[PDB]
Amino acid sequence: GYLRCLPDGNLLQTKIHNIGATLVGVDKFGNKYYEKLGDTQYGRHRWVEYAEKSRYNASQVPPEWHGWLHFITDHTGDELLLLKPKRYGVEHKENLSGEGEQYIYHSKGHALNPGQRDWTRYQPWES
Amino acid sequence: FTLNFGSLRLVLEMNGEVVERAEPHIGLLHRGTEKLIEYKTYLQALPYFDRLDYVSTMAQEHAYSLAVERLLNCEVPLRAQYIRVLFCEITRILNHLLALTTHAMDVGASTPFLWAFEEREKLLEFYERVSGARMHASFIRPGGVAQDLPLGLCRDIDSFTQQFASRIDELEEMLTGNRIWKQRLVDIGTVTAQQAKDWGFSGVMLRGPGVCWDLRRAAPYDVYDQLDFDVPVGTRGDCYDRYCIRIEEMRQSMRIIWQCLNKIPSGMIKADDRKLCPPSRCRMKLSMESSIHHFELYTEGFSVPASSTYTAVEAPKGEFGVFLVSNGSNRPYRCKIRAPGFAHLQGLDFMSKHHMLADVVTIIGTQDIVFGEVDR
């Protein structure tokens, strides 16, 4: 995705920064994670290309690569995928929060919930 | 005529652009902090002190913990004392940087703001590595600290101290000696030592006149009596001398940080007794008594003996004091919060007398009024 650079200018900065970088990994969502040591300042030696140039979001980074990208861990996302728990767990989902009422989270008492639960803590006689 | 400005509300009486008098209205950030502290346990009330005087976070934690330990009589280990001093001086550096750069922006100088924010981002990274969050980190607790320092923090702080000596030289070169800066600062809002004592000034605003009195030397509440630092005083109290005092305080804070890094000991991070300090996770998961004490300390609190005390520390703004009155229960009966912005904002009235509007904003910047602590 290089034509998006002209109207994006931020992907342009990313592509400029991927000149001397080394592709340290890639996730199952397509995000390509790059590292670049040497003559680089501390804060800009690890980054991601989201592989979704049109509508890339900051919440698309999976938890497996979140720590490595945020400099919490030296462990890449592959090791955390290997260590992913079994018998339970859900796939990573972005922070939609506005893409639809059927997508966003609703409380059990909210009218938009598919199943709304009453809250009275007593059972009437119910003739 | 009366001119109104509207969280800083201020009404000024003007005659010829000359400020006859200035009256601030402050309650715009009142939040019932004292009432909530009375309604909550001591540990639950520590975040309130985190929020008070938010530019200087851990100074208020230090004051509150010192008051609680005074009312409680618990010995804090040397390592905990040294890390508390280190982070208090980091807090002082942060507050001085923010005060100086906001004052410079109010004057008109815009560029040092972002350099000092790069330095502040480094220091907030230090905070976030040592504790939970960059700001309002509930790290200092009665009896010690929350957790031990992560490894490498000392080396990173040393690197920061060197680069920050360079940065302070840099900022002083740009601001100090500028003709515009001098014309903005000198002979603006001068305070005599008698006036400062009458109006209850503290910290830089009190040492600016030259009273030659500092809390860290008058009542050393830490290893401060082993750190042989310097305390600058102003020859003729005004905005320029207060700014120079703040620069010198940043330098001496770096000095104290280096000394603490050099002579930090190896030991524990909190009070030895589990009746007052929570046990570790392994201890509470392995030991029956430790589980009991963790449960009791996290449902109830430590019951301080019924007494009333006033504990004051040298916060970067000035003397920050907490007046704690207890009744033997797990909650503080009364907690009065003397912030070194409440008195300075009173001093605004006579400081910005016969001055102009730009002198008023310069005086506000010099006093460095954070409205959270004045609306405590």
Partner: protein, 181 residues
């Protein structure tokens, strides 16, 4: 003001000792030496490298002991890690946690209702350190801005799914910090 006048005269006499000094001072005040020096420093920083983070692709450094989004974990077997000890809201300074519970079908003590207000949580980590079983943890996630307050009002199912989603990173941070405990 007579004292001020005589002090000014004394200072003027002091800093006008000789023609060399007065000429140097006049030239310095006339040719804007300090202004030129400030301009030179400004140009140096114009030509030096920048520290901008390039937000969406490059993100600021964090720590394993980061207080981000409240979340609930599970045991490796799959059962809820949270017993209903109610130490969360006993210590929560902002009272942002509400919990109700009853005995489960197999006699286990489990919470039948567990909600946290993210508009009332002060993100202080008191619950995550008061948990006897490491059930509630303040996860590393912090980019969960919502368009609605009702969305920001969490509950047990959302906390559990957050824990399941962020289980691996939360586990890594928990190991690293249980070392520091």
């Amino acid at each position: 003001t007579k004292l001020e006048d005589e002090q000014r005269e004394q200072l003027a006499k002091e800093i006008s000792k000789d023609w060399s000094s007065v000429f140097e001072r006049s030239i310095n005040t006339l040719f804007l030496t300090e202004m030129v020096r400030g301009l030179m420093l400004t140009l140096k920083y114009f030509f030096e490298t920048k520290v901008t983070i390039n937000y969406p692709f490059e993100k600021g450094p964090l720590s394993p002991r980061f207080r981000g989004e409240h979340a609930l974990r599970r045991y490796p077997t799959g059962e809820e890690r949270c017993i209903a000890c109610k130490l969360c809201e006993a210590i929560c300074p902002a009272q942002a946690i509400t919990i109700e519970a009853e005995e489960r079908e197999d006699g286990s003590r489990r919470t039948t209702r567990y909600d946290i207000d993210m508009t009332k949580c002060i993100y202080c980590g008191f619950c995550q350190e008061a948990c006897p079983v490491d059930a509630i943890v303040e996860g590393p996630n912090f980019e969960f801005a919502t368009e609605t307050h009702e969305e920001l009002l969490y509950d047990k199912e959302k906390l559990l799914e957050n824990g399941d989603r962020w289980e691996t990173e939360i586990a890594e941070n928990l190991r690293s910090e249980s070392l520091y405990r």
